[PDB]
């Protein structure tokens, strides 16, 4: 193959070119693209429904020309005699005179309830909040709204009060966990109206003992619209390079007398998966609204992760210089065992979590008593599979190192024809293993750095966004990894 024939100078040159490309991949994210996500906090406007529901929606608007009759703060409903079901928390998702665009491509909403601590009125042991949520969309101002979804959204209140329960600390807010609210897969329309209602009933326990809610907040998360454009440019630049190199790789393979060996087919499949990821399908989300885009982009990268693990284990297995011939995938209980089962479990998990969110944007698998059990069982099985795969990989690495050590005591006593074959096999295995370890170390190190850091540095006169720099650099690093795999391990002249 090409990796065998090339001298040290050509290998160093191609490594340097890849290094330059990876530096560019870091720099594009660091110095061009803004932060990956934008979290904007909203305060719900407590409108007053001073009528009886006549089967016609009102779409209480918080601010603007037709703004709802609102109470600025609770305890204003006591002088005005306002019931519990007559308060409609309304949030206009585009903060005044702004507008959402299809360059955000996802819309995460989560609720942050403000509950005051009162000695008489406290949160029950198992408090569930039931919300009569109605969501609407609108492209042009001075136009009607249209209902996207309207269903009851039940959430469990996991609130705690660290402060002592003495009357000296009454009126303090509960320290409560954030409730997952909604995630729609595409920013279809410019404006969104969200009305949240909290009906109460004493005969059947709905919104009973949920505490003393003062305000409910809401955080809107989207992909910043500028990180999206840079990501799209990167994907558009990466798809033709990978596609051409894969076509060239398979064209060279289907030019020799021998049929392809297992390792070359696995490399071809890994290139296929990388190509599948970097096809810029999401450009079509700018003109068309498809809520299934997150599912597609999740399945693509899950497939690539599974194929990468399979490639690692098969590369380790094939490079042992044993008496057995280890082509013919049938016999790899090490690959299809944990990897396939874990991938299937994660696929079921994402179909039951992000797949159901398509029809019901407010669905969360964690709210159901048995749904969370089934989900956590799926992640438990996936984690067990991942641990088993890591154990098998470590065992295979130890075995291949032991085999290399055993052979290397008898390389000099060979016919200097197959001896060069074994020396080259050992060198190629060590070289790719060190590259894989270095790539994984960089991935983990920069991931930890991004997770622990705020996101942007100021070493110079310009902010350096390391959060998006991570994503661009990892994308480029693994694309270049697949590129080097398909270029080094290709048939040569």
């Amino acid at each position: 193959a090409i990796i065998e024939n090339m001298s040290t100078k050509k290998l160093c040159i191609v490594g340097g070119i890849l290094l330059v490309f990876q530096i560019i991949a870091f720099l594009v994210g660091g110095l061009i693209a803004p932060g990956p996500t934008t979290a904007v906090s909203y305060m719900s406007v407590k409108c007053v429904d001073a009528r009886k529901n006549h089967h016609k929606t009102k779409w209480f608007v918080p601010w603007g020309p037709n703004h709802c009759d609102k109470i600025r703060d609770i305890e204003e409903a006591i002088p005005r005699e306002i019931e519990a079901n007559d308060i409609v928390f309304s949030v206009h998702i585009p903060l005044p005179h702004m507008e959402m665009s299809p360059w955000f491509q996802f819309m995460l909403f989560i609720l942050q309830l403000d509950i005051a601590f009162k000695l008489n009125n406290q949160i029950r042991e198992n408090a569930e909040v039931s919300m009569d949520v109605s969501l609407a969309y609108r492209d042009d101002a001075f136009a009607e709204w249209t209902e996207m979804a309207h269903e009851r959204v039940p959430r469990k209140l996991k609130c705690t009060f660290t402060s002592p329960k003495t009357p000296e600390h009454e009126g303090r807010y509960y320290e409560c966990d954030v409730l997952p609210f909604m995630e729609i897969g595409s920013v279809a329309h410019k404006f969104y109206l969200l009305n949240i209602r909290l009906p109460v009933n004493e005969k059947k326990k709905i919104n009973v003992g949920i505490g003393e809610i003062k305000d409910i907040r809401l955080v809107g998360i989207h992909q910043n619209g500028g990180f999206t454009k840079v990501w799209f440019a990167m994907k558009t630049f990466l798809t033709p390079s990978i596609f051409i190199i894969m076509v060239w790789y398979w064209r060279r393979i289907t030019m020799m007398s021998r049929p392809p060996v297992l390792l070359e087919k696995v490399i071809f499949a890994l290139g296929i998966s990388m190509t599948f990821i970097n096809i810029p399908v999401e450009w079509f989300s700018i003109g068309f609204d498809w809520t299934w885009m997150l599912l597609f982009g999740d399945i693509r990268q899950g497939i690539f992760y599974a194929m990468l693990l399979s490639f690692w284990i098969i590369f380790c297995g094939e490079h042992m210089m044993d008496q057995h011939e280890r082509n013919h995938i049938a016999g790899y209980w090490k690959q299809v065992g944990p990897i396939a089962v874990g991938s299937f479990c994660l696929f079921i998990f994402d179909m039951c979590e992000r797949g159901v969110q398509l029809t019901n944007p407010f669905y969360s698998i964690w709210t159901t008593d048995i749904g969370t059990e089934l989900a956590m069982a799926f992640i438990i099985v996936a984690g067990i599979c991942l641990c088993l795969y890591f154990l098998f990989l470590c065992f295979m690495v130890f075995q291949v190192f032991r085999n290399i050590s055993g052979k290397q005591s008898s390389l000099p006593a060979m016919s200097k024809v197959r001896r060069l074959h074994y020396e080259g096999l050992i060198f190629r295995f060590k070289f790719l293993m060190l590259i894989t370890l270095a790539c994984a170390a960089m991935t983990v190190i920069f991931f930890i750095v991004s997770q622990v850091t705020e996101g942007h540095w100021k070493w110079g006169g310009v902010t350096v966004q390391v959060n998006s720099a991570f994503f661009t650099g990892i994308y480029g690093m693994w694309n270049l990894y697949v590129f080097a795999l398909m270029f080094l391990y290709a048939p040569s002249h």
């Binding site: 609770i74 305890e75 308060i87 500028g226």
Partner: protein
Amino acid sequence: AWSVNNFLITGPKAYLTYTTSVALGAQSGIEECKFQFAWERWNCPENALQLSTHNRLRSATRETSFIHAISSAGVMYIITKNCSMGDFENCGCGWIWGGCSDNVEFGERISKLFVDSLEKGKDARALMNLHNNRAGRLAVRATMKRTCKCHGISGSCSIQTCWLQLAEFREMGDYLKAKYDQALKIEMDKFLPSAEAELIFLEESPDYCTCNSSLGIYGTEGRECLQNRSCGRLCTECGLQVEERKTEVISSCNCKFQWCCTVKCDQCRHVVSKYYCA
């Protein structure tokens, strides 16, 4: 000083619809300052807000440092809620490319320009107020709570979005009261600098328990407190009277509750041990 008329005449241009909210937020800080000092010899009286401008040498006390910080903090808090509630058109903004400043830099800047313009001079007292106002704004940023959400691969933590959320105003009042307990007296000019997050005063407080009409002191006479604890030492030391009234007080009692609202209650009679110091 912190009045709507003063914020209008002595206020920045190009931000004219905010002056009603700026003065309103300054009042929110004052009523918090009154709460934090309800059991002390100085109950954050509203007199030391407009009469505390002149006579800067005798008004550069530890208490006026808390006045400026809590008022500047209140303006930042009230404007941030206004922007989050949509009460102002553009708060922070590109929107398409990179988003905005999380509607708290706008609240900080609106607070900064409106309250820093009040101090016309640049003398020793003026430097103090600019320092104390900045310390109050920093206390708002320091008290902020950080919460994060994992929305990665299949809802994993491959990508995490983290945002800052304002704490309730009571938390910052406690934070600034703590900074008031540890305050630095400066020597003749605000020689060496001082920490950005620390309150600074210039002249020591007077004997507040003794009544002085000229110095705007109402004395520690005819005031409620608690014995169970802070008073007594603030009443027996200065003031030869305790005079436990033991007068009945009517309050809410045996109520049925919902998450909010006007509710069904009754009247409940019980005597209490209220005190009037001195």
